[model samples]
Target: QIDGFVRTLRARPEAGGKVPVFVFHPAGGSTVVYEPLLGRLPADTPMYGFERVEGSIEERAQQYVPKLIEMQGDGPYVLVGWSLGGVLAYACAIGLRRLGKDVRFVGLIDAVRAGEEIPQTKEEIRKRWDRYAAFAEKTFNVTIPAIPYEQLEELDDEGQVRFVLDAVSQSGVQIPAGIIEHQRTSYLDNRAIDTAQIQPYDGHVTLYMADRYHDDAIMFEPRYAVRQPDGGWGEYVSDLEVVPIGGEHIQAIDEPIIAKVGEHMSRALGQIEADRT
Candidate 1:
């Protein structure tokens, strides 16, 4: 089958599962992260996910919404996104609503709530890199290298990403060139969006909020902490439920605690079936 932004991850086994569950990609823009989630949800719950693509939030939404309409034909749609994916999902939901579609569910897995500050100055960005340096030390057992701050800022975004990844690769970590380029592309696609402009969604949304970031040794600042009780999304979504995931961040989609998130989703999907009947 020819590939596009949307891929049919799995088809529902039951007759009642007419509407599909569509998930947006994470910051990396790969839908593969959601592969483990399929095993956790109901076997009868149809699933689809979007791969990496470009454009502003709404522009990106426009690209997928129509194609999905051709596939599913209608609403009671379930739109999901993880981290930054949640932002795009919300934008898509807004587009769907404008067309009078029924969006019964919006699932944000440890999503980024709108209105957070982005670094306005290169120096401010450099300070934020402090956390990145600490994380690099822990993960790869290497430093980010002592490049002069001003000189580092002078390089474009790709240059900066390659500089750091190449440094880590040269330090016996064996990171790949594609990995560096992928990281750079993903960063560039994600950074240009104005998260502050993400509108308040007047609909029901369930935030699969993580208990804490899975990796604590990364040495993140208090400012980088996950917002309490709903990842600061209580303000943006008019109707919201905060579901606690035992795991942290997207790591919850994997083993050990994967069942925790799956169970809640199963219940929610089950309820949808019950309601339809």
Candidate 2:
């Protein structure tokens, strides 16, 4: 059942079962990435993923909290997110808690904290752009030509998106119309909203990190650390559990690697059930 941001990836209608797990969308604003992990979860456990929609982070959270409550129908909410979705999941959890809802679990899959600065200066911007282009080439096999730093700096959000689309089209790669636009807009909008405001969460958090030594590792540096008030990277959540799984960021969610994540999730959910008993 895909409606707006809320989609039931797996439904368990059995009475008196574990709390439903809600997942957040990654950068692409699509829940398809989580498809692989759905089958690995407990058959009776319902799961949902919140796809990205048009709005700021806070706005999206505000829109989603009610729907989530309506769907689950009360206490002990379980939430999970990967990449940018993780940040949104945290925000949604905070909002739900404020509204007197009990959030039992917050699962962050290789998600970084908000408040990190995006590239601003010409050199910085160009470097970031180059990296994006490289990633596209490597992952999607689409080559994007380098844009002049000055020209890129002059473009607004829409212009930047158009520029990328035009470049991708000119490179002779076929991309569905409006696909890049939606994805880029969602990415930029989410980034802007999260970077501007990051609310602290005072609840237990579980972090799933990819092995750095893996060949498919997406990020080389330790991105799990949260920025402290004193300009240092420190633990964000006071109560945190870190789990290391095989494969890199993207690969971590694929195949044999995802099984490890599923195992951890099963154990965590089991603990919650035990505590209740």
Candidate 3:
């Protein structure tokens, strides 16, 4: 289950009081992506990130249920997701609503809509995974990742490659071993979840899709269409406002965009607080 708890930053009473903001990351990504944005948002706003299931970052995405349940006790909140994270956020909000919790807003940052069908054949899956791995290795100069990135230009490929390798090495995990199996299991586990539990998300939802690939990161526009499941961009979400960011999928991590997200989330927090009072 994904844990839901607030990491309260510096209080900004000046920002008209803080509110709760929950964020979700894209598939093949982690909560660390949001670390930079934390300092820019309103100090008073309490923030929390939904962590996908441990090790299942590829095709199968898992939700953190216990964390979300814990969050309900904290009161009305705003939810946000980036890329694959958006789908999970939508599902989480729906689940929370079913539990009779109040959700003020749900933001999807470059997220994929649900119900899209991904290629299922072993050969197709293997080929797609190989493509991403090759891209990550060549573009980012990192050793192959078990799960390939959607946009490779979002990060300084060389920098990210170095970072990933260093991190894995420091953790003392064997390199290039079990990455495929681990990520495959992750994808499969997510697929096993009841589809009924994820559809028709409740409350206001929004998506921010990138216009182009900006850096060496793996996620890019040309690749997005192919990567999406059978559904077109909007199939999964019933009610949503789509916002197209000018850059690639990694723009969410860019300095300027991160600031924009912080400001946007801050406003959302204020709105949630106003509604509560």
Candidate 4:
């Protein structure tokens, strides 16, 4: 069952019946992260902010799929997610279809694709941590900015702290002991399931691909790395649309960028509504 809270933004009276759009947040973040996106679209449209699972970031991440299933019943709905939330949204789309529910569309906003690993192993994770420690030693402890990285080496101690803090605050829960440890376990566990879920979603999929990115060029390029081959993600879906938008990974929540997202979503909703007639 869904352990987190859900908030809805009801549609306006004049808009007829509004479509439902469920927004999921990233790891370590809560539904509050989507607060900026609430009520910014058609008033009649119903927007739901799904709270993160109530536990460690990793635990919630692993539990996202089951929790999403409990969020709503069998009905037509639009599913959208940002970053880690996007990953969960993809899983929900598959689950909905399996349960014979109508999933009009699945939107992936600046989300990471499955099978892509950071550091490649636990030792690598430790190595990266050590590198950050060296940088922290030199910087004398300063808060890091969410800046684009020219190279992986550029992500110093401050950057590491920034990343952790963002993940924690955005994770949507109060920090507790062993959170990282739990998250590490959750990451590995969910990865396998996510890969299976993501690979089979051969339906209406739209990748709101982020045009701009920080960290490394590899983060944006190498489409094959992010998607599957053999027509898995591409051929499985009837309509696989890719929309390019300006902004970093967080554009899904940006006021200006979200307006564009809403416009695109409104257009998609129109197609679904029109088909019903």
Candidate 5:
């Protein structure tokens, strides 16, 4: 019923005790980046990804659970999320359990906790922008001139992307406005969740944290830098476990980092299966 919104990232084995794994897509909702993970996860474990979604948190969870049960048989499923997808995964897990689905594991990939006010002072904003500028030059070879929060706050989200796109184009830095627009949209979507709105979750959540701390990584607000151990998820999540991933936020889903994540998940999922019997 949901080939459009739900995709089979990894196919289930023809015969195995391993249940399916479903993950929510990061902000823009594309699952293509996770293609690398297919090779690393255990051969027996199937992986599915939710395409872009729209709605309140509960609504998003509702949309995912129906399509999930339709594609795979009910119960004993693994749910995971990365970045903004992690929050959705948390909410969706609650939705699944309430519906009597047998969810086995919940994994959060470098996803941060919600409720901290986004840094707004000029000094705070520019400091984070500096961090991105150096990294952007080193990583993407694109040089971005700093835009002040006053200048940035004037425009809407898309306008903000276009504003920077216009700012950098004259400098010969060619970042397509569309790509960054989605990146911004994803962050804003993540920013939309407030602490009051976050429902308490009863299950255990394994947060795969990037041990290398990034100060002000998200130039928009820099929420990626986590000072707390559980990424500030201890309050809402009853059972929280942290595992270090040895990389930063942006590079996390990339090749070697993803490869590392795959090996870890492979072991983790195997244990989940182990405990089932």
Candidate 6:
């Protein structure tokens, strides 16, 4: 039984167990995002989620890997992460390997690589924001009015997030105030730290790529979508297997696509079990 910051969302309390799957939380630093996919995994397979503690990426990795090893008590870990969590998962795998632990399987779901160019221009940022806003509105059934780039530039990072949440609330969306507060404070810092600390991973990785391009629906004037460098995951992980999943970045985590992700992960787990025998 693991406690403190790491929670077992699903339990497989059978007498004998396979390696536990550790799923890292995404940029929001909330394991709640993984709820939908959890039920799709094998019933007897234990699944755990790691929450982000306040620290630099390296510091968090240092703290988490040891605790994870302590919890699992051995090698052959199954690591899976999405978005920013994917970056951290890679780091944790590196740390585990250095400690002479075996990481049997690593899965990255629509994760961006380290050192990738982030949208910096006001127009670009606003466009991306609108895209996400549209997605949230569609997925959660709430309206999100587009905020002008000039207005967004006036606010600090947290302030901008608060402004967005305010807009969501004003548009009749009922989200928990606590979630808003957490996202306002944690999102920017987490993204910055993780992106800055990302190092290449030499191990094998299964990358789930979102098929729809970011610019598929233009909320504003056409601009080139921020594309990943050619060879995407191959740029960060030397031995890479790519699985193209239908939907954009955000949509990939919803509905049919998430089911596909679960199927792939389950298959990976099966292979790990087979390898053990």
* Candidate number with greatest TM-score: 1
Candidate 6 lDDT (Cα, 0 to 1): 0.71
Q: Ten consecutive residues with minimal summed lDDT in candidate 4?
A: 215-224
| TM-score of predicted structure 1 | 0.77
Instruction: RMSD for all candidates, in order, please.
Output: 4.2, 5.0, 9.0, 9.0, 5.4, 6.1
lDDT of 2 by residue, 155-181 (tens): 655466667667658866688868876
Q: What is the per-residue lDDT of model 1 for residues 1-277, given as tens digits with 9 covering 90 to 100? A: 1277767788655465545788888766577777777788877667888866666667788897887677665678888877667777777888888888888888887774432455557885587566677677898786556646775687655566667666657766676668777877776555544333666787888888776664441243334354566577666777998887765675755765667767887788888777888
Which regions of candidate 5 are displaced past 4 Å? 13-17, 118-184, 194-196, 212-216, 223-226
* Per-residue accuracy of model 6 over 1-277 as CA lDDT, tens digit each: 3477787877656565767788888765577677777777777777888986766677778989988888776778888887767767877988888888888778878774422454557776677678777777897997766457787877655567777678658755688878877777565654454235556767778888875445532232133244454325565667888887867866766677889999988888888888889
Expressed as tens digits, the lDDT of each residue in 1-277 for candidate 5 is: 2488877776776766577778778766577667777678877567788877666667777888887777665677688777777878888788778888777778888886532555545565456556657777887876666546677665444455556556656865676768766766665565445332666777778888886445444444545443577687888887888888877766677788888778878887888888878
**Model 3 weakest 10-residue run by lDDT:** 54-63
Q: What overall lDDT goes with each candidate model?
A: 0.70, 0.69, 0.54, 0.58, 0.71, 0.71
lDDT of 3 by residue, 200-248 (tens): 6546666655554334333322233433322243455566566555566
RMSD of 6: 6.1
Ranked by lDDT from best down, the candidates are: 6, 5, 1, 2, 4, 3
Clashing pairs in 6: none
Better of 3 and 6 by lDDT: 6
Which wins on lDDT, candidate 1 or candidate 3? 1
- Model 3 reaches what TM-score against the true structure? 0.61
Sliding window of 10 residues with minimal summed lDDT for model 1: 215-224
Q: Sorted on TM-score, highest at the top, how do the candidates line up?
A: 1, 2, 5, 6, 4, 3
Query: Higher lDDT: candidate 1 or 4?
Result: 1
Q: What does the lDDT read for residue 147 in candidate 5?
A: 47
